[PDB]
């Protein structure tokens, strides 16, 4: 009967942690691209939710167990857990009335899901242990060992799958986040059902969750009496717990004294969790700026998180089977609390790499306009070379260029404005002809001056250009119709476009990457097909439609903007380091808490263990909002900040039993 005894719980954890991580994998992007929040506001809310996901709900969970019991609270909390998920999915639906409802509705979904996740976590994990007596200690330890693998197993599939649905389905919108949250949401229902099937297997224990509350009362009772009395003559009885000895039994006081000693080690911990929890919130914001194209399948920005769960699955049992055997062979002193000390080092070292990676992004970043600074390109469609002089408001030649027939300037020549908006007299010369052409310009934007020809005469048409190849991170097309007839274009089954006559300009249209040799299009008179050749990822193309005696519609191909040079693969070293610390810190610390607590006090540390996680994220919240540093500097800040803590932790741990 034992083989079926605990099967349900582990399967429930996999499904349950599948749902949670999948929802939290795309959570950061959902804020940036759907609610249109800025980075600081987007990271703040995300980490607030993660902190709230552990801060209170665990305490509520233990309190719920005080009179309701472990089994029942799982069912009820898991019920509201689903409720928060389904309502969250509704918020992502664009039909629900714009950001006014989405923001308010989503945060309600986030609030409920947070309550459920941390409300069940303290109970479900310990619930499995009670399913069989601890006399099978090795099996009990095995259960927890395999249990932690199951948690990652759910994250692995969920983290890899959910980001795909965020940009692939595009059912109701180009992104369709609703399906991304929906699939995890429905899966949690399966988790609840499977867990419910185990109700007939084991006799659930009665409520006992008064342990955590009682300990807190003793401290409050002890500290208050010492603070108020202020006798001044108190001997070593000054020890606060001795004050509570007046009321509480000696055995309870003795247990708390031993418990308090170990609990000191938890004070410097939360700074470390500020690093691991930053994976999905600030490194994904970094992966956006890096090139995603690869020889393998093109990876989504946040989909890179799959590495962290993946590396945990191979580092375990690799650390236990190999690394720990080697170090113990050279020295056995390391098979102790010192493991956690090194864990803080690697994460601190991991961010140091992130600073190095971040620096290179800025170095490889292309030139950008700025305040009273504008980027201008010039394209010549005249049959012969045209000489162009950019005469500013001072009558001085701000820039001088000469462009042959059907050619463009190699780069967006930068220009400096005297105001946010300004006009410049772009003098033109064509054969013996000359003309002063004036167009308006604005700061912080790209501009393309299209010199157009009318018979032997020429004119110009200023076209505003904006970065539209990295924001969408997908191939984009652009069309100019020099004909005196509008041209209807069926770009694909997902998009269609028409270009106005007389050098009409179309808007940026995103298209699927691939070859398009037979794009169907119809003029005002007859149908036609155009060959565009290959279109690459992350590149924008501008096509000029011209009349041809034989081809009819003749299209000239020009690359509007190239792609980035920094490959996303360069982010792997970060996860290799930080995940190495996690497996060497999270796992060992968890077993340290369960085993080092006094008798029957294990529940207190399990509560304290998650608290330091919650407090850890809040540090990221305040730093991410009220600090104001440059990102490359922030990773350095955490790297050195944690390094100091590691010294404090190691020094503190050195004197522990």
Residue numbers in the entry: 41 to 697
From the paper:
PepT1 belongs to the solute carrier family 15 (SLC15), also known as the proton-coupled oligopeptide transporter (POT) family, which consists of four members in eukaryotes: PepT1 (SLC15A1), PepT2 (SLC15A2), PhT1 (SLC15A4), and PhT2 (SLC15A3). PepT1 and PepT2 are best characterized and mediate the uptake, distribution, and resorption of di- and tripeptides in the body. PepT1 and PepT2 are secondary active transporters, which are energized by the inward-directed electrochemical proton gradient. On a structural level, human PepT1 (HsPepT1) is 708 and human PepT2 (HsPepT2) is 729 amino acids long. Both polypeptides consist of a core transporter unit of predicted 12 transmembrane helices (TMs) of the major facilitator superfamily (MFS) fold and an extracellular immunoglobulin-like domain (ECD) placed between TM9 and TM10.
HsPepT2, on the other hand, has been trapped in a substrate-bound inward-facing partially occluded state. The HsPepT2 model is lacking the first 40 residues at the N terminus and the last 32 C-terminal residues, which are predicted to be disordered. Recombinantly expressed and purified HsPepT2 used for structure determination was stabilized against heat unfolding in the presence of the dipeptide Ala-Phe in a concentration-dependent manner, confirming substrate binding of detergent extracted HsPepT2. The N and C termini of the dipeptide are clamped by electrostatic interactions with N192, N348, E622, R57, and K161, respectively. The phenyl group side chain is accommodated in a hydrophobic pocket formed by Y94, W313, L316, W649, L650, and I653, referred to as the side-chain pocket. In the HsPepT2 structure, the cytoplasmic side ends of TM4 and TM5 in the N-bundle are in close proximity to TM10 and TM11 in the C-bundle, narrowing the exit route from the peptide binding site to the cytosol, although without fully closing it as instead was observed in outward-facing HsPepT1. In the upper part of the transporter unit, the interaction between Y94 in TM2 (Y64 in HsPepT1) and N657 (N630 in HsPepT1) is disrupted and replaced by an interaction between Y94 and K161 (TM4), restricting bending of TM2. Additional intrabundle contacts including Q319 (TM7)–N348 (TM8) and Q316–R322 (TM7)–E674 (TM12) further stabilize the partially occluded inward-facing state. Last, the interbundle salt bridge between R206 (TM5) and D342 (TM8), together with the polar interaction network around H87 involving TM2, TM7, and TM8, tightly seals the central cavity from the extracellular space. These interactions need to be disrupted so that the transporter can cycle back to the outward-facing state observed in HsPepT1.
